[model samples]
Target chain A: PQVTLWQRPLVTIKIGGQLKEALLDTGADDTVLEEMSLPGRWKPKMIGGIGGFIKVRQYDQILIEICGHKAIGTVLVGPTPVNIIGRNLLTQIGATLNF
Target chain B: PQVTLWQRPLVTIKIGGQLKEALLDTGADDTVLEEMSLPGRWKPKMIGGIGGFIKVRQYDQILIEICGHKAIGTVLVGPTPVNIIGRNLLTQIGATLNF
Candidate 1:
């Protein structure tokens, strides 16, 4: 699918046994999602910063079905305004930006 | 140019008589740059949030050369960690997300 840049690049994804809409954020480095309770072994990831890291939960090896494509990667759970599928998972689905 | 999602999509842009690198951000709705006073009549675009708007100056008809493609559009100037060429400008260059 070739998605135009005129609107937010939102897509349906299956994660944590539910269907959710997430933005394909090319700007963000990692995927970030709203806080959710999931059954997994996750560690608290201090978000990156020059001064100190932010307290954020990182769930690794999570399976996600994005736009009918399968992807397994680390997802950061925090107080993000929206669910974002960053370059980490974008590359998993062979996503690219073209002109 | 077809940009893979494995890396930060940084590109050279010619703006305000300087060549600078900016991220091609498909997630952001508007292009945001660091503080730079330009020749134009712009009003402070208070983003309707935080119980009010913020001082994000919106400059219209700004000419920019992005990756050798010429584009003229509204460029927002504010305090951003990195210069971002968002979807608004990305659309002007006919950019698209593909898989």
Candidate 2:
């Protein structure tokens, strides 16, 4: 299936049996979500971006479904301005840069 | 050619006869570059993102080359933390969201 590049390239994703909206951020190395409850032990880490850095809880393995493509990878929960789905999971779905 | 998604998907682009690095920000609606001298008439506009909004000088019909593909479109210049290449020009180069 082809995904149209929206102004924000947002997509619906399912995590922890819940639906959530996320930006398909090719720029980010890790998936960072707005604060949410997850059942796992995590380590605190900081990630820097265009604006600055933010604290995040890095969770090990989590299953996430993006447009029906299921992937298991690291999911960072934190106080992000937006929920970002990064390359870690994108690669699992065989996402690529095309022109 | 395949472009690998980096932590920050930075790409080398030619704008105004000069080479510059820009983030392939599919999440951004418009291309925004750091302050630079561009020979053209522009109008002031505001754009919003993760952190907040910023004022930009919008230039029309600018030539931009990304990964060897050339495109002409609106380019915004301002005090941006990073240079961003958005969907406006990406589509011109036939960039699409692939999986």
Candidate 3:
């Protein structure tokens, strides 16, 4: 699928046994999601920040389905302006930026 | 050209009459940049999707050259994590997302 940036590139993603809306953000190097409880051992770490790094939980081997493609990867739990599917998962789904 | 999401899609852009690096962020509704002295009368507006709307200067009709494509549009001045080229400018350069 090819999408233009004329509108928010929001899509439905099946993750953690539930369907959710998220943005496909190419600029982000990592995937960030709204805070949710997960059933896995996650690492406590901080993410990107200017003043400092953000404190977030990192979950690994999470199964995610986006646009008919399913992938198992790392998903960081944090407070995001919007739920974002970044390069980590995008690469697994073979997503590309075209012009 | 087609680019995979395995790396940050940073590109050279000609803005403010000079060359600079910026991220091609699909998630941002508008392009946000680090503080810079742009030569123009820009509008002051408040905008943000998280916490609250943050005030920023909006420069209209600004010329930007990205990946050899030149586009004229509005460029938002704010304290961003990084220099971003968002939808407003992405659309002008005919950028698209594909899988």
Candidate 4:
């Protein structure tokens, strides 16, 4: 079948006006654009993990596109072990990650 | 003592070769660079949250520097509620969050 969001799909993106490709994990709950994609607007926020809550700051949303699909979602700026493609987005099209 | 890593320290950063300022939360156990900062190489990981663990993919680590200090640590590329400045990186400098 023609695919939209792959389970752990590696794709390209343009962040902060810069275009590049990245691996995207659809299993995640929220959409996270590559941090490097936002060249000048990534505001940082400190947070807790593994066993705690976090204090987060807010930032503006960026334009994201993949396989002819595009959407604008607000993203938190931070370093992740991997790129994410989450259900919060895929459900929009009734899509599921085919890992 | 001198200052380093702050509790919600907002600063500018360059990700995936793109640059932006973000809030650094020292309270976080781990430091998270902005996802947008990583333009390319943002691989996806299928993870479970609030109830379980999920599958995940791997990606390359990007170079990161802050306050004249830089390090190359393997990272997971994913969306976050906010940026992070955790003990893993800050303790190395004997730094503490002021706020």
Q: What does DockQ give for each predicted structure?
A: 0.49, 0.52, 0.59, 0.02
What's the best-to-worst order under TM-score? 3, 1, 2, 4
Between candidates 1 and 3, the one scoring higher on DockQ is 3
lDDT (10s digit) by residue, model 4, range A1-99: 232221223556555556656443322345544345354455555543322333333356565664346756655544444444444444443343211
TM-score of chain A of each: 0.89, 0.93, 0.91, 0.56
Candidate 1: segments with Cα more than 4 A from true spot: A46-54, B47-54
Comparing 1 with 3 on TM-score, the higher-scoring candidate is 3
Candidate 2 chain A worst ten-residue window by lDDT = A1-10
A15-72 per-residue lDDT for model 1 (tens digits): 9998889999888888878788778778887653111234678999988899999999
Model 1 chain A — which ten-residue stretch has the worst lDDT? A46-55
**Considering chain A alone, what is the TM-score of candidate 3?**
0.91
Sort the candidates on DockQ, descending order: 3, 2, 1, 4
The regions of model 3 sitting more than 4 angstroms off are A49-53, B49-54
lDDT of each: 0.83, 0.82, 0.83, 0.43
- Which pairs of residues have clashing backbones in candidate 2? none
Worst 10 contiguous positions by lDDT, candidate 2 chain B: B1-10
**Residue range B20-98, candidate 1, lDDT tens digits:** 8999988888888767767888878754211123367889999999999999989988756578898889999999999
Per-model TM values vs. the true structure:
0.90, 0.84, 0.91, 0.36
